[PDB]
Ligand SMILES: COc1nc2ccc(Br)cc2cc1[C@@H](c1ccccc1)[C@@](O)(CCN(C)C)c1cccc2ccccc12
Ligand SMILES: COc1nc2ccc(Br)cc2cc1[C@@H](c1ccccc1)[C@@](O)(CCN(C)C)c1cccc2ccccc12
Ligand SMILES: COc1nc2ccc(Br)cc2cc1[C@@H](c1ccccc1)[C@@](O)(CCN(C)C)c1cccc2ccccc12
Ligand SMILES: CCCCCCCCO[C@@H]1O[C@H](CO)[C@@H](O)[C@H](O)[C@H]1O
Ligand SMILES: CCCCCCCCO[C@@H]1O[C@H](CO)[C@@H](O)[C@H](O)[C@H]1O
Ligand SMILES: CCCCCCCCO[C@@H]1O[C@H](CO)[C@@H](O)[C@H](O)[C@H]1O
Ligand SMILES: CCCCCCCCO[C@@H]1O[C@H](CO)[C@@H](O)[C@H](O)[C@H]1O
Ligand SMILES: CCCCCCCCO[C@@H]1O[C@H](CO)[C@@H](O)[C@H](O)[C@H]1O
Ligand SMILES: CCCCCCCCO[C@@H]1O[C@H](CO)[C@@H](O)[C@H](O)[C@H]1O
Ligand SMILES: CCCCCCCCO[C@@H]1O[C@H](CO)[C@@H](O)[C@H](O)[C@H]1O
Ligand SMILES: CCCCCCCCO[C@@H]1O[C@H](CO)[C@@H](O)[C@H](O)[C@H]1O
Ligand SMILES: CCCCCCCCO[C@@H]1O[C@H](CO)[C@@H](O)[C@H](O)[C@H]1O
Ligand SMILES: CCCCCCCCO[C@@H]1O[C@H](CO)[C@@H](O)[C@H](O)[C@H]1O
């Protein structure tokens with residue numbers, strides 16, 4: 001008739017999922033930008049020895065992107081396999 | 087007009103979609119500004135390093151913008167193909 | 173009492189506000205950070221001025237793209253709400 | 258009697274409007290502070306050639322303040338000419 | 344006591360007003376601290392530049408505080424003269 | 430069931446929390462940033478100490494003004510709620 | 515039977531209290547980290563004269579922690595002595 | 601199943617608890633990263649200052665982590681011993 | 687209609703989302719800031735490399751601890767909700 005329990009649960013899941021991905025993008029965009037800031041400046045300062053900067057950059061971006069995609073996976077769980085759905 | 091389940095689900099979807107895109111823009115705006123800060127500073131320090139520095143700059147911006155547009159895709163999923171709609 | 177669109181529209185306005193609120197945080201801070209580098213760059217090399225304009229405009233262009241794309245979707249949310257009944 | 262549709266829409270509009278102006282002030286306060294940080298430091302470093310810093314500062318503040326006031330305009334739309342009001 | 348439309352509108356106004364002032368303080372506190380960071384650093388670097396540096400400092404703080412107090416004015420509008428009150 | 434003031438008071442407490450939450454973010458980070466400059470300034474010039482106190486106190490004064498003005502309005506929101514029925 | 519007024523007020527109080535402490539920890543963690551960043555760097559640069567850094571550090575941390583604990587006190591008021599409870 | 605007061609109180613507690621821990625992690629992650637930035641930079645600048653620099657680093661991390669775990673304690677209070685439960 | 691657990695579970699999912707949203711903000715920015723120092727440190731002293739690994743890993747370890755402890759409590763919130771009726 002009117003509302004049912006899953007309408008409220010699903011609304012909660014979509015808001016929760018949004019928080020997860022919203023936070024993920026804040027962390028990833030700013031974290032990657034900060035890492036890349038050092039890469040750009042390091043290459044500017046030391047063009048001949050820049051190769052040694054790339055594994056540290058990719059380790060850093062790897063960590064940052066792992067947070068983004070682990071969050072993405074839990075957003076997908078929230079909205080496609082909602083825990084507590086009735 | 088009686089409330090119905092999709093009214094609540096759609097309200098949650100729009101809020102969730104807003105969180106996704108709001109966070110996306112925070113990460114992209116600040117991440118791109120931080121990347122650009124190093125680009126601008128590097129060119130100011132060494133004029134002829136301009137070509138050299140656009141390469142790590144675009145790698146960084148690529149990473150930052152990937153977050154923005156993956157978030158955009160999921161906002162679109164939330165509001166145009168809402169998971170859990172009844 | 174209430175009707176379905178009252179709830180949907182309330183959600184759209186909150187969603188729209190999140191979109192624009194986040195857009196201004198990203199654009200204001202991103203542009204400030206870009207301009208910080210422009211100002212410092214010019215102070216360091218008073219006639220580096222000319223060569224700094226292109227990277228400043230590219231950076232601001234990217235930052236402003238996020239603001240404007242968000243603005244467009246806020247407009248969609250509140251003027252053509254997806255899911256309106 | 259009890260609630261009416263516009264009570265809920267208007268509550269949404271006020272919360273939305275608050276998000277718009279809250280975010281606008283975060284972006285403007287921090288963005289202007291960051292721009293002014295460079296202005297202060299530049300004037301400290303180069304008092305004789307500081308005049309060339311002011312158009313770049315005002316362009317930057319112009320961009321930052323434009324975000325604040327465009328947001329202000331949409332807050333005013335949300336709360337004084339609410340889209341979707343019944 | 345039955346709920347009434349203004350109860351919901353006023354709740355939205357208070358939340359909206361809180362967002363406005365919460366964001367205002369984030370922008371003002373951090374923006375002023377960032378401006379002051381350059382002032383303090385500049386005086387440490389060159390003692391007799393103190394007078395010189397307060398001028399761009401107060402221009403910056405003026406901009407930052409304008410955001411805070413314009414936000415304050417609209418919080419006051421929201422909670423004392425609520426747009427849309429029935 | 431419910432009554433009008435239950436909803437208004439719930440909104441006031443959420444609004445009050447936003448005010449103080451934002452106030453502490455601004456004050457904690459703003460003060461930390463001001464103190465960062467004070468500490469670095471003293472480390473650079475160990476007897477610049479005296480001349481740094483005034484600009485530090487002016488900066489902290491401004492930051493703390495935002496915290497305290499927010500505190501006052503949180504108090505208004507929760508102890509004298511505007512719009513209470 | 516169903517809901518009562520204090521259920522809604524108490525839910526508001528817990529959310530409000532959460533906002534207070536959530537914001538308090540953001541301000542304290544980042545503020546202390548920023549202060550400590552300068553302490554670490556200052557001690558690195560000037561090991562012999564580092565003692566003069568500690569009162570400025572503790573004044574700064576004092577200010578930052580005061581925001582955290584004043585917020586904590588108001589969270590405690592919100593959730594243990596809720597203003598407006600019926 | 602009819603709604604009951606504790607359903608609403610517990611929902612508020614979980615949201616409040618989430619705000620507490622969400623803010624705790626923002627402050628701790630960023631505060632610790634900022635502290636570590638000075639540690640790493642200081643060791644890079646002067647290798648044998650390593651021992652010296654861990655002392656102010658752990659003082660800083662102690663302060664930052666205190667915020668995280670005091671917040672954790674109050675999240676636990678909110679969700680396991682909810683103040684105001686009926 | 688509704689039942690008590692619909693409201694509790696909706697709160698748990700929102701709470702869980704706040705926990706993980708905040709966790710990723712802290713971890714992404716904290717790790718980026720740590721890596722920024724690692725990259726700059728190596729660029730300054732190309733064979734400082736070895737001695738920078740330990741402080742980098744300690745910093746990342748602390749940052750990641752916040753992410754993981756948050757993850758565990760999100761899991762508690764949504765898979766074993768405290769207060770479920
Ligand atoms: C760097 O990795 C770590 N460091 C830690 C440091 C301290 C503590 Br106390 C916990 C830590 C835990 C971990 C991981 C881990 C490894 C194994 C099991 C559980 C957790 C991690 O949490 C990292 C997530 N980061 C990158 C945002 C993780 C979580 C979830 C899914 C993952 C998938 C793939 C890889 C890592 C995954
Ligand atoms: C710098 O300006 C831009 N750069 C962009 C860069 C990339 C992309 Br893809 C879009 C961009 C769009 C714009 C503007 C624009 C110009 C014309 C039409 C539409 C949009 C803008 O969005 C800027 C807002 N900023 C400052 C926060 C704008 C929006 C709304 C109202 C405005 C009023 C006055 C001035 C600008 C106004
Ligand atoms: C530095 O202290 C200040 N500077 C200001 C600067 C400008 C303005 Br306009 C107001 C200012 C107000 C104050 C304090 C104050 C002193 C006396 C009375 C009222 C307020 C303060 O607000 C500081 C909180 N900070 C540290 C987050 C405070 C509030 C509440 C409880 C406190 C308990 C103990 C100490 C300070 C306490
Ligand atoms: C915590 C950061 C660890 C980064 C990896 C450091 C160990 C590998 O270091 C790598 O050594 C190679 C040769 O062996 C070089 O060609 C690479 O430039 C360098 O990154
Ligand atoms: C984010 C994508 C938009 C980029 C548009 C401008 C691309 C500029 O591209 C860059 O131009 C420089 C000169 O300005 C050259 O020196 C560089 O080699 C080139 O990469
Ligand atoms: C994407 C483009 C963003 C531009 C931001 C608006 C400010 C325009 O900046 C203009 O740039 C010119 C280039 O020579 C300068 O000479 C002008 O003085 C300046 O007004
Ligand atoms: C992108 C934001 C500006 C363009 C908004 C989309 C077009 C506006 O759409 C119009 O808005 C009017 C009020 O302005 C309403 O009264 C009308 O019903 C509506 O058609
Ligand atoms: C800025 C780019 C995206 C803007 C999308 C806005 C779509 C607005 O769409 C408009 O909605 C109005 C009612 O609000 C109607 O009167 C118009 O017929 C309709 O075209
Ligand atoms: C993107 C930033 C563009 C800033 C404007 C640069 C072009 C104008 O530059 C201006 O030239 C004047 C004389 O012509 C000088 O008196 C000013 O100091 C200088 O700002
Ligand atoms: C934000 C407004 C509050 C400011 C109060 C203090 C004003 C200080 O004013 C400044 O004092 C300096 C010495 O301390 C002088 O050298 C400067 O010329 C003067 O501008
Ligand atoms: C707006 C004022 C903010 C002050 C913050 C509280 C710390 C007071 O700081 C005091 O400043 C004195 C000035 O000489 C120092 O000598 C004292 O050691 C110090 O305790
Ligand atoms: C600015 C924050 C501190 C001052 C709060 C405003 C005055 C407090 O007001 C009092 O609060 C009491 C609990 O403390 C309530 O029990 C009383 O009903 C109320 O009169
Ligand atoms: C800190 C500056 C602004 C504080 C505004 C607080 C106003 C509190 O006002 C007080 O409310 C109490 C009930 O809570 C009543 O008992 C008192 O009569 C009333 O004066």
Ligand SMILES: CCCCCCCCO[C@@H]1O[C@H](CO)[C@@H](O)[C@H](O)[C@H]1O
Pocket residue numbers: 482485565566567568569570573
């Ligand atoms: C605003 C910052 C004020 C910090 C306090 C400065 C005044 C006291 O300064 C203190 O003087 C002592 C001897 O008198 C020294 O032993 C301490 O190292 C020094 O901090």
Ligand SMILES: CCCCCCCCO[C@@H]1O[C@H](CO)[C@@H](O)[C@H](O)[C@H]1O
Pocket residue numbers: 650651652654655661740744748
């Ligand atoms: C946050 C607590 C976890 C810390 C675990 C590692 C502790 C490292 O401890 C440090 O090790 C250094 C060499 O690496 C020594 O030079 C320092 O004296 C010592 O403090």
Ligand SMILES: CCCCCCCCO[C@@H]1O[C@H](CO)[C@@H](O)[C@H](O)[C@H]1O
Pocket residue numbers: 059739743744746747
């Ligand atoms: C708490 C530990 C966090 C580690 C982050 C994952 C990256 C591991 O980094 C590894 O460190 C090694 C140390 O010598 C390097 O030699 C390897 O090249 C590198 O892959």
Ligand SMILES: CCCCCCCCO[C@@H]1O[C@H](CO)[C@@H](O)[C@H](O)[C@H]1O
Pocket residue numbers: 081757758761765
């Ligand atoms: C820490 C996050 C990963 C571990 C999650 C806790 C264990 C999962 O728990 C299981 O989740 C399933 C879906 O994955 C549900 O279908 C099951 O009902 C539930 O038992």
Ligand SMILES: CCCCCCCCO[C@@H]1O[C@H](CO)[C@@H](O)[C@H](O)[C@H]1O
Pocket residue numbers: 083757758759761762764765766
């Ligand atoms: C990651 C460390 C904390 C994880 C806490 C997760 C507790 C999950 O607990 C599990 O919940 C499932 C239903 O969701 C049940 O099927 C299982 O019986 C139960 O053990």
